[PDB]
Design a protein around this nucleic acid. Structure first.
Lengths: 64, 68
DNA sequence: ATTCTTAAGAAAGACG
DNA sequence: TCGTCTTTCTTAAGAA
């Protein structure tokens, strides 16, 4: 309506909708962050597995 | 003018496009959430493999360095 | 020209 | 009752 309680309610709702959308937008980028971070660590751990396996076979050929 | 029939068709075409694009995003978000779980499981499998090999390599060293 | 993507506003419940 | 938060529908502007 042409009220004034309506105008303040619309303004407060617009504030609330913007806040709720920016919050939900970061939670989706936060999940996208974890994908790039877990892919970083899983590739570091995979290099560590190869490193340890290499040194185990180097150490085991001392038996020859 | 600005409420022609070109306006109605364009706005009805855009409504269909917004629903299609919004459905793709929610799906793309849901696939990312599932990627996190399988990467977490793989991260746990790799951490346990590292510790297993770390203990195996440690014990094998202690044997060589304890040579009389 | 089009479709696709993004941000915004409005209204209705959900919630405390 | 009041409030804020969350969700659906739609529009408008701009990117592709």
């Amino acid at each position: 309506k042409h009220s004034d309680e309506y105008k303040i309610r619309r303004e407060r709702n617009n504030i609330a909708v913007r806040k709720s959308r920016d919050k939900a937008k970061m939670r989706n980028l936060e999940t996208q962050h974890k994908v790039l971070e877990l892919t970083a660590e899983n590739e570091r751990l995979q290099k560590k597995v190869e490193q340890l396996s290499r040194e185990l076979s180097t150490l085991r050929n001392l038996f020859k």
